[PDB]
Amino acid sequence: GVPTYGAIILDETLENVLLVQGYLAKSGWGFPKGKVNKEEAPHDCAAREVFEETGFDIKDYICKDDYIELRINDQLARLYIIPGIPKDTKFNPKTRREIRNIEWFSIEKLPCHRNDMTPKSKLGLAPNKFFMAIPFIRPLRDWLSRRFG
Ligand SMILES: CCc1cnc(C(=O)NCc2ccc(F)cc2)s1
């Protein structure tokens, strides 16, 4: 799959993270990210996708070694970690045709797994609007503990 790049933006308290909500297949909440273009560097793709989805330019804040990368179904997603962005920042996507809404969420309240259906003796996982964000949550919490503590 084509690699994706984007950001985990945190506020100044390190409490909250910025998520975006798309439409249709992308209808839940997730970190801002998207597919790398031909010959485009990872940092440039992250900034481009993040500015397209949120209107905030991370270019001056990216740190090369500060990211979480996950491979999910043989597609690689790398989110650069961007702390210290004020919660009163005005975020506005490029077009509302791709992004419904943009919100801060408390890290400690976000799930780091979906719930099973063991109450119903049924296999699988219950729907969860944070599905796309969930895989990054435990790694982010561990990364923040190691880097700030
Ligand atoms: C089917 C499972 C999914 C549910 N939500 C998905 C998703 O990607 N939401 C985040 C997002 C990322 C980039 C955007 F441009 C717009 C929204 S995918």
Structure token digits, residue 67: 């990211």
* Ligand 1 atom closest to the CA of 21, numbered from 1: 17
The rounded Å distance from CA 21 to ligand 1 centre is 7
CB 14 within 8 A of CB 83: yes
Ligand 1 in reach of 6 Cβ (< 6 A): no
DSSP conformation class of 10: B
HSE-CB at 106 with a 13 A cutoff on CA atoms is 2
Q: How far apart are CA 64 and CA 147, in angstroms?
A: 15
* Ligand 1 atom closest to the CA of 34, numbered from 1: 13
- Residue from 26, 31, 35, 100 to probe ligand 1 pocket by mutation (most atoms less than 8 Å from CB): 26
Ligand 1 in reach of 93 Cβ (< 6 A): no
Tokens 């063991």 correspond to: 118
Q: What's the reported resolution, in angstroms, to a tenth?
A: 1.6
Ligand 1 in reach of 62 Cβ (< 6 A): no
Q: Cα–chain-centroid distance for residue 130?
A: 10
- Give the technique used to solve this structure: X-ray
Q: How far apart are CA 35 and CA 91, in angstroms?
A: 21
Nearest-5° angle of CA 75, CA 81, CA 85? 135
Domains in the chain, ordered, with CATH?
A: 1-149 (3.90.79.10)
How do beta strands 33-35 and 122-125 pair? unpaired
CB atoms within 10 A of CB 18: 24
CB 124 within 8 A of CB 116: yes
Structure token digits, residue 12: 């100044």
